[PDB]
Ligand binder design. Structure first.
Ligand SMILES: CCCCCCCCCCCCCCCCCC(=O)OC[C@H](COP(=O)([O-])OCC(O)COP(=O)([O-])OC[C@@H](COC(=O)CCCCCCCCCCCCCCCCC)OC(=O)CCCCCCCCCCCCCCCCC)OC(=O)CCCCCCCCCCCCCCCCC
Ligand SMILES: CCCCCCCCCCCCCCCCCC(=O)OC[C@H](COP(=O)([O-])OCC(O)COP(=O)([O-])OC[C@@H](COC(=O)CCCCCCCCCCCCCCCCC)OC(=O)CCCCCCCCCCCCCCCCC)OC(=O)CCCCCCCCCCCCCCCCC
Ligand SMILES: CCCCCCCCCCCCCCCCCC(=O)OC[C@H](COP(=O)([O-])OCC(O)COP(=O)([O-])OC[C@@H](COC(=O)CCCCCCCCCCCCCCCCC)OC(=O)CCCCCCCCCCCCCCCCC)OC(=O)CCCCCCCCCCCCCCCCC
Ligand SMILES: CCCCCCCCCCCCCCCCC[C@@H](O)O[C@H](CO[C@H](O)CCCCCCCCCCCCCCC)COP(=O)(O)OCC[N+](C)(C)C
Ligand SMILES: CCCCCCCCCCCCCCCCC[C@@H](O)O[C@H](CO[C@H](O)CCCCCCCCCCCCCCC)COP(=O)(O)OCC[N+](C)(C)C
Ligand SMILES: CCCCCCCC/C=C\CCCCCCCC(=O)OC[C@H](COP(=O)(O)OCCN)OC(=O)CCCCCCC/C=C\CCCCCCCC
Ligand SMILES: Nc1ncnc2c1ncn2[C@@H]1O[C@H](COP(=O)(O)OP(=O)(O)O)[C@@H](O)[C@H]1O
Lengths: 347, 140, 126, 320, 121, 40, 54, 99, 97, 42
């Protein structure tokens, strides 16, 4: 599309998210979600092909259903109390409806099915936006109403998300589906700590966003969308593959990397509330994410796969466009564990 | 809901074998029905009749597992004269695993099922005794 | 129980079109349901909002739906007691949109302009 | 300021650059035909920019210094070995074919970039579109396998679906016996080994498959050896015809912006030429890959970006 | 803890006025040095990705990297110290105002405490 | 006397639509390289 | 060496874990991509959450 | 109830007249012997829908003029009309109103 | 009371019909529109019963936004048809989990 | 390609670094003085 129109649409997406984040009226939050959904569809469909169109319609149907149930929950809450302010939910049925709507907006299990297909259908830039920016508004709304969530439903959906992400990532050779399942598992980790501490949720979201931005930018730099295509990168730019390997090790929660900070903290917080079994199962299940990260690292940088002759021509050329903040994203996603006590800034 | 859980738990551990068996059978049947609904939704095999056959098979398997577990655990607790002991649940769990292995007609699942189920039932009994919480309330 | 009778019909029409037979017939069922719902709102006392249903919903959105398809193949107790004066409160609250709801007008107008742009960009094709 | 979204937003519109003479032109013919002289004369008369036919070391002439690199660092193939032993054990024939297609793709991208950046037209020899005739002949003579032509078809699909075909196709027709006499006169000992069958299949592919498909979306001027001697009538024919059937009149400023962002950034042009399809003729083992890549790095001016090589005489590296 | 609803809190203030009563972090703070090290690593990685001599490609760029990291780290350290000070202040005030929830334990001596002994055999 | 490195046979196990192929999945095909489906 | 170390100790911990995780991965990821079944499942989970957690 | 009776009478008379029209000539004995999907028409329908939404927004103007906040109301009404004109201009300039 | 229950029941029926997905994505869009109409009726009744004057704008707003969404959905549907010749739901199986 | 050291960008980067350093040092001094004044140290 025209660059002016693209910039306007991106600004509209961000403005819808910010309208959700700054408003105290339920109708304005709904309007922010509507504006975000309206501006999001062209961004997914920017490169026109049947796959992108299919992904856009799937995303539209899912988000429209979620927004309809969100409006229903708002109306029920207003019926049982003449309130429009986003606070305590005042009704269990309305709160269950709101939780389910926000879960489908986020892609938590069992509403996870659309995330892998939408991510596979769209390009890498649209996938970056969808997996990083499109999580802020529902998580902020969940943080604002955390004191009213039924912990049983929230914890059930979080544990299901962790399990589903871990199991679904094992079967994937497409990198975008791997990212989608990783996102589902990280969303489960984020939402398993909402009932106890929203600061932990925000810290996990920040760390995950940094890591996802770094990995998506590394995938864009080495324009690969499959495992075998990524296995050719060492013969053109081995530095990119080494950086990606360290980032993948960080994403697996291995200390002393940055990705260890959230789980650690979350586990600690859960233990402070006499919750022992669930964090144990959560770490056991995150082992699966680590396994398929390690498989990608094996195929990418720790071994050398066969190349092709036409790669020689590619040796004579350099990337014309360089993404700023990529080095900062890599450093922030690998080496911020010693600065862990900074979380008291209520990030 | 928790109604079935209340019906099962309100019975004392070493008494009313028939009531405990019936409650465990009901819980197993409910679990099998839920699994059948999910399987039918995600995988429509060929037709309505095959779907109802699959639903009935899953429900009967789950109900039989629950019934065997409940009967065996209650009988073990009664005859051993040592209630509040996880070995009775372990024995019940192993029996349930064996019942499932016999239903599927394969020794590896039965052997594997018996060991894992026995462990899970003993763990649940230990959690009841010690007060372990799976879904903890936000204390702090 | 006139309101109750309308409500029962409303649900029956919803069951009719929710079975999703022959989308033209589902559209006819949704048209009947929308008419009954507008009747409910009118019988309640919301004349402007019921007429807004009847005009906007039925005559624009369901008309566009049918056009696109054609291209292809207990009561009376909870009520008030006093009167509203020499105006209608619903009209006053709706007209307060330009004096109280400046923020609402701004965000809605921006959304509608963005919607026009988005529709054009999506239907461009290429 | 390099071209990008910001340049497009502020001032850069390529539609005002077109001046009815852009008219990308491609000239095709059999081996050792007179098409090169005709294309050079067309470029000289019309004021366009001539592109000599892309060879094995075309990419070397555009990067670093224009001097070609070693054969094992650039191309890993030779035409003389194909002429001597076309039925090679090492599958050099298809390696040469794939490398030549990639070179033609790079040259087409360069020509499109020049045309869209300046408005001046360009003249080309055998482009990517006409590249297939050699592959067809090489298949009918038994030099390559069917898997090779399938791989070529996949690559050609994913690459050529993103560019505008040439406005005018100029074909020179020469008889096979006359062209064999011309090879005899050339004196190149390796060229004297081409059988008449190879030339006949080249001509058959050209006539049966390439000419009619280009006649459906472009303007075609079929010329003989005699009437290609005078370029005046050729230029008169070029000016007389008008392009109204091709996709070029359909293009607008937005599509031009997209295609101009594509023609620069050569790594995106070359992206799908190395798809992970493992055919023994082109797949290279890890050890040889590592050795050859390390060897390439050793060459002066290749270790660091173009402006960051002290060995080459670059200065103020710390401040750049 | 959840100090979001703490009374007298300005909605979007990075550092309140009352934060100025606390000692500022020293410029040789080890955490500040680690932030500068992070900036230096970012500069080196920027050199490596762009295919430039890693150690000595852009000195101005590396200096800007380090300086920006140090600047943001200083302000972040100030905010973190202030937040921990608030936590401790509230804890002590609450303990003072609820003496019946925090009784003084009657001190006992090990000579009058009977602890069970387990031999290792 | 040489370190082992993956070869074509080793590299082909990651070229399918998914890992761990089954009877149901056996007919699945990887997406196109440019992620474009012919208009047909 | 053979029966215990190479077979049964291998069978118990690592091989069983691999088999179970791979079977669960095949179960979870083998979905045809039809919104029919996905939204039917959504309806089922909505009913379960309505009638089980309250 | 008066409007209900009026609508009932109108519908009853229409049905009776149409039925007698369709059944009077059916008593005597006689012989008794695609793809295109134009985009432009869809675009016209969608433009109608969006402009109708903006009309729905503009409708309360006859009541909006008695508020004592005349400057704010005038500003917001002119804002709505200006954005409606901007939507028309955008559709016009990007070749959205051609045949 | 009973009137509120019927409106909710209509919303639940429309949501269930949307989640059934027999075929004909147009039926899905119709179910979404029925859900929104139910929401409009319910919110209007609540706002009128309690004499919340300033809330009288809220139904209109909702309607407008919903119709905009409807337009968007319709556009998507058309594009899908223009690729397959039909609005059949089973034709959207290129992307899979 | 063939490019000289861009003196504009180098100057801007160096000036930004110097300005940030001076601002940080001044801010630290003011913080120390204000803390001392508030707590009555010096
Ligand atoms: C923390 C939470 C953060 C969550 C995730 C962050 C969101 C990242 C997405 C934002 C924009 C997308 C993007 O920049 O591409 C990804 C980008 C990679 O760049 P790329 O892949 O080469 O760009 C491809 C574009 O899609 C190619 O598109 P293009 O060539 O058409 O680009 C046109 C360009 C140029 O725009 C213009 O032409 C300017 C003209 C003004 C228009 C006037 C309109 C007013 C009405 O405008 C933009 O790129 C969009 C800027 C939007 C403005 C936002 C304020 O990576 C990042 O931006 C990472 C950002 C790091 C986080 C944000 C800052 C740290 C906190
Ligand atoms: C850490 C330090 C070092 C540790 C070292 C490692 C030690 C740990 C590993 C030890 C593993 C030994 C047992 C593994 C499980 C056996 C089942 C199996 O592998 O399935 C494959 C296999 C199933 O394959 P299939 O297709 O059904 O038929 C294959 C046969 O050809 C068809 O066979 P069939 O049809 O003729 O079988 C009939 C009959 C077997 O007939 C007999 O004569 C055996 C009865 C004694 O089976 C029975 O009636 C059941 C008794 O099962 C068998 O064939 C053998 C099953 C009978 C073996 C009895 C197990 C031995 C003792 C186990 C108890 C020890 C403690 C257990 C702890 C439980 C609570 C935690
Ligand atoms: C508690 C921890 C304490 C230590 C902290 C550790 C981390 C600190 C540093 C973090 C990163 C910052 C620097 C790394 C940038 C990467 C650039 C690079 O590759 O190196 C090239 C460059 C030399 O090569 P070149 O000739 O310039 O150009 C070649 C091209 O760059 C490209 O050459 P090429 O393309 O021809 O070669 C390709 C090669 C190139 O591939 C690479 O080398 C990429 C580097 C790995 C990725 C970096 C990850 C990001 C940071 C995460 C760190 C993880 C730490 C957590 C612990 C887990 C350990 C893994 O890739 C491969 O061969 C593929 C095989 C992969 C092998 C296995 C991969 C393992 C990676 C894990 C590395 C972790 C430690 C790295 C230590 C530093 C490495 C330089 O290295 C350097 O010389 C710079 C290193 C640092 C400079 C120090 C100078 C300061 C001294 C001044 C005075 C002393 C200070 C004291 C003051 C008081 C005195 C008075
Ligand atoms: C990988 C680590 C994360 C990196 C994050 C990106 C880094 C670049 C961002 C640059 C700084 C952004 C701060 C914005 C400037 C002013 C902010 C101020 O106006 O807002 C305050 C808020 O300030 C921010 O919250 C502090 C952000 C600091 C983030 C650092 C914590 C990182 C965790 C520890 C890892 C170490 C990282 C160190 C290297 C960067 C007031 O918040 P308030 O409106 O009243 O309450 C709303 C928030 N609630 C609901 C959670 C309570
Ligand atoms: C502060 C930061 C400014 C720059 C950042 C802008 C961020 C994005 C733009 C959106 C901000 C909207 C600003 C207006 C907020 C509305 C409230 C304010 O304007 O007061 C109103 C005053 O109305 C003003 O006249 C509104 C004028 C603003 C509209 C003109 C331009 C709007 C463009 C905003 C961006 C939308 C897209 C851009 C189109 C070009 C209320 O009037 P008043 O009567 O006292 O109070 C009503 C209550 N009563 C009845 C009890 C008395
Ligand atoms: C509840 C969930 C618990 C989660 C437990 C996580 C265990 C961590 C390992 C999970 C790995 C599972 C995946 C797997 O192994 O797949 C089988 C895989 C198939 O090969 P692929 O590389 O996938 O494909 C090659 C052909 N293209 O087989 C293998 O390679 C097995 C090698 C890895 C196993 C290494 C040892 C792992 C087990 C050690 C014991 C620890 C178990 C941890 C849990 C035990 C309970 C406390
Ligand atoms: N696709 C190809 N396969 C094999 N050889 C090729 C190919 N393209 C060009 N050549 C070789 O390039 C050489 C010179 O090109 P040609 O047009 O035939 O003669 P000239 O340019 O001197 O008029 C010829 O020997 C021809 O065989």
């Amino acid at each position: 599309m025209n660059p002016i129109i693209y910039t306007t649409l991106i600004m509209t997406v961000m403005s819808g998210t910010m309208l959700v984040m700054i408003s105290s009226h339920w109708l304005l939050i709904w309007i922010g979600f509507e504006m975000n959904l309206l501006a999001m569809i062209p961004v997914l469909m920017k490169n026109f092909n049947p796959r992108a169109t299919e992904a856009a319609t799937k995303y539209f149907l899912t988000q429209a259903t979620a927004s309809m149930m969100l409006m229903m929950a708002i109306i029920i809450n207003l019926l049982y109390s003449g309130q429009w302010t986003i606070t305590k939910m005042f009704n269990p049925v309305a709160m269950t409806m709101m939780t389910m709507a926000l879960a489908m907006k986020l892609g938590l299990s069992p509403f996870h099915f659309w995330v892998p297909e939408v991510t596979q259908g769209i390009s890498l830039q649209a996938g970056l936006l969808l997996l990083t920016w499109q999580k802020l508004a529902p998580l902020s709304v969940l943080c604002q109403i955390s004191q009213s969530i039924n912990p049983n439903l929230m914890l059930t959906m979080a544990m299901l998300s962790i399990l589903i992400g871990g199991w679904g990532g094992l079967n994937q050779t497409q990198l975008r589906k791997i990212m989608a399942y990783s996102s589902i598992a990280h969303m489960g980790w984020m939402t398993a700590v909402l009932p106890y501490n929203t600061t932990m949720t925000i810290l996990n979201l920040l760390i995950y966003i940094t890591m996802t931005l770094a990995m998506f930018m590394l995938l864009i730099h080495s324009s690969a969308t499959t495992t075998l295509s990524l296995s050719h990168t060492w013969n053109k730019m081995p530095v990119i593959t080494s950086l990606m390997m360290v980032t993948l090790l960080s994403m697996g929660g291995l200390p002393p990397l940055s990705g260890f900070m959230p789980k650690w903290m979350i586990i600690q917080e859960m233990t402070k509330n006499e919750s022992i079994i669930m964090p144990t199962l959560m770490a056991m299940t995150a082992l699966l994410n680590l396994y398929f990260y390690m498989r990608l690292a094996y195929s990418s940088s720790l071994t050398m796969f066969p190349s092709t002759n036409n790669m020689k021509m590619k040796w004579q050329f350099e990337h014309t466009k360089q993404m700023k903040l990529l080095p900062t994203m890599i450093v922030l996603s690998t080496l911020v564990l010693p600065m862990t006590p900074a979380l008291s800034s209520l990030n | 809901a928790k109604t079935l859980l209340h019906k099962y738990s309100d019975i004392p551990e070493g008494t009313e074998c028939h009531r405990k068996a019936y409650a465990s059978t009901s819980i197993g049947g409910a679990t099998g029905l839920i699994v059948s609904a999910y399987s039918i939704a995600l995988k429509p095999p060929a037709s309505f009749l095959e779907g109802v056959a699959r639903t009935g098979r899953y429900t009967f398997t789950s109900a039989a597992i629950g019934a065997i577990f409940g009967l065996t655990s209650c009988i073990s607790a009664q005859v051993r004269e040592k209630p509040d002991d996880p070995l009775n649940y372990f024995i019940g769990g192993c029996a349930g695993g064996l019942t499932l292995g016999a239903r599927t007609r394969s020794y590896g699942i039965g052997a594997a099922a018996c060991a894992y189920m026995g462990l899970t039932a003993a763990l649940v009994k230990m959690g009841q005794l010690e007060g372990w919480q799976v879904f903890a309330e936000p204390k702090v | 129980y006139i309101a109750f009778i309308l409500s029962t019909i409303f649900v029956i029409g919803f069951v009719g079109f929710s079975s999703k037979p022959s989308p033209i017939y589902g559209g006819l069922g949704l048209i009947v349901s929308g008419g009954v719902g507008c009747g409910i709102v009118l019988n309640f006392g919301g004349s402007f909002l019921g007429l807004m249903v009847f005009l906007i919903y039925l005559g624009g959105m369901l008309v566009v739906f049918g056009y696109t398809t054609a291209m292809a193949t207990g009561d009376w107790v909870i009520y008030d007691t006093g009167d509203s004066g020499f105006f209608s409160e619903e009209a006053m609250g709706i007209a307060a949109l330009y004096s109280y709801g400046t923020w609402l007008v701004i965000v809605t107008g921006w959304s509608l302009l963005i919607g026009v742009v988005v529709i054009m960009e999506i239907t461009r094709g290429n | 300021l390099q071209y990008g979204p910001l340049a497009f937003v502020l001032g850069e519109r390529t539609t005002r650059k077109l001046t009815e003479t852009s008219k990308v032109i491609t000239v095709d013919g059999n081996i050792c035909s007179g098409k090169g002289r005709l294309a050079r004369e067309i470029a000289e008369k019309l004021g366009l920019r001539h592109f000599p036919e892309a060879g094995i070391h075309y990419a070397d002439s555009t990067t670093g210094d224009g001097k070609p690199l070693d054969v094992q660092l650039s191309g890993n193939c030779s035409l003389e070995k194909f002429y001597d032993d076309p039925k090679s054990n090492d599958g050099n024939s298809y390696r040469l074919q794939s490398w030549l297609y990639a070179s033609r793709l790079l040259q087409y991208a360069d020509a499109l970039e020049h045309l869209l950046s300046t408005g001046q037209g360009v003249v080309l020899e055998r482009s990517i579109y006409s590249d297939f005739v050699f592959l067809e002949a090489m298949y009918r003579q038994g030099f390559i396998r069917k898997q090779c032509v399938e791989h070529y078809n996949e690559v050609k699909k994913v690459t050529a679906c993103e560019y505008l075909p040439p406005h005018v196709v100029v074909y020179v027709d020469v008889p096979v016996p006359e062209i064999q006499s011309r090879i005899q006169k050339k004196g190149n000992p390796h060229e004297m080994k081409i059988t008449a069958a190879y030339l006949q299949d080249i001509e058959n592919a050209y006539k049966k498959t390439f000419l009619p498909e280009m006649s459906e979306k472009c303007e075609v001027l079929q010329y003989s050896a005699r009437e290609a001697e005078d370029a005046e009538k050729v230029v008169e024919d070029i000016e007389y015809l008008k392009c109204d059937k091709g996709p070029w009149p359909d293009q607008d400023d937005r599509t031009f912006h997209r295609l101009r962002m594509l023609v620069q950034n050569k790594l995106e042009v070359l992206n799908y030429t190395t798809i992970p399809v493992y055919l023994p003729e082109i797949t290279i083992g890890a050890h040889q890959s590592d050795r050859v890549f390390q060897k390439f790095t050793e060459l002066p001016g290749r270790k660091y970006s173009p402006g960051y090589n002290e060995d080459v005489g670059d200065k103020w590296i710390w401040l750049k | 803890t959840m100090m979001s609803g703490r009374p007298g809190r300005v909605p979007l203030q990075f550092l309140p006025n009352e934060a100025r009563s606390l000692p500022p972090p020293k410029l040789t703070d080890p955490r500040l040095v680690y932030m500068g090290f992070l900036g230096y690593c970012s500069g080196l990685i920027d050199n490596a990705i762009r295919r430039r001599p890693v150690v000595s490609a852009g000195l101005h760029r590396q200096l800007l990297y380090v300086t920006s990291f140090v600047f943001f780290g200083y302000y972040l350290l100030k905010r973190q110290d202030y937040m921990y000070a608030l936590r401790d202040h509230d804890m002590f005030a609450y303990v003072k105002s609820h003496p019946e929830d925090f009784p003084e334990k009657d001190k006992k001596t090990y000579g009058e405490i009977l602890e069970e002994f387990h031999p290792v055999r | 006397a040489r370190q082992w490195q993956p070869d074509v046979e080793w590299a082909e196990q990651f070229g399918g639509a998914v890992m761990y192929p089954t009877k149901e999945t056996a007919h699945w095909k990887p997406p196109p390289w440019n992620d474009v489906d012919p208009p047909k | 060496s053979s029966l215990l170390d190479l077979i049964w100790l291998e069978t118990i911990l690592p091989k069983t874990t691999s088999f179970i995780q791979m079977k669960m991965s095949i179960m979870v990821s083998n979905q045809k991509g039809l919104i029919k079944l996905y939204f039917l499942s959504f309806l089922i989970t909505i009913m379960i959450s309505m009638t089980l957690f309250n | 109830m008066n409007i209900m009776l009026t609508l009932l009478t109108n519908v009853t008379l229409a049905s009776l007249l149409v039925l007698i029209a369709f059944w009077l000539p059916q008593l005597n004995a006689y012989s008794e012997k695609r793809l295109p999907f134009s985009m432009k028409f869809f675009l016209v329908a969608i433009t109608f829908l969006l402009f109708d939404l903006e009309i729905a927004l503009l409708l309360p103007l006859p009541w909006a003029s008695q508020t004592n906040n005349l400057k704010t109301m005038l500003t917001m009404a002119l804002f709505l009309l200006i954005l409606l004109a901007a939507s028309l201009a955008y559709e016009w300039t990007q070749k959205g109103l051609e045949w | 009371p009973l009137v509120y229950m019927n409106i909710i029941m209509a919303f639940a029926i429309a949501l269930a019909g949307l989640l059934m997905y027999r075929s004909h994505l147009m039926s899905s869009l119709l179910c979404l529109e029925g859900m929104m109409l139910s929401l409009f009726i319910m919110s209007t009744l609540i706002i009128l019963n309690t004499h919340f004057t300033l809330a009288n704008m809220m139904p209109i707003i909702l309607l407008v936004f919903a119709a905009c969404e409807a337009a968007l959905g319709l556009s998507l549907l058309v594009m899908v048809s223009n690729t397959y010749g039909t609005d059949y739901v089973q034709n959207l199986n290129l992307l899979q989990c | 390609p063939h490019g000289s050291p861009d003196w504009l960008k180098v100057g801007l980067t160096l000036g930004t670094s110097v300005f940030l350093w001076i601002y940080l040092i001044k801010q630290h001094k003011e913080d120390v003085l204000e803390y001392k004044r508030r707590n009555g140290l010096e």
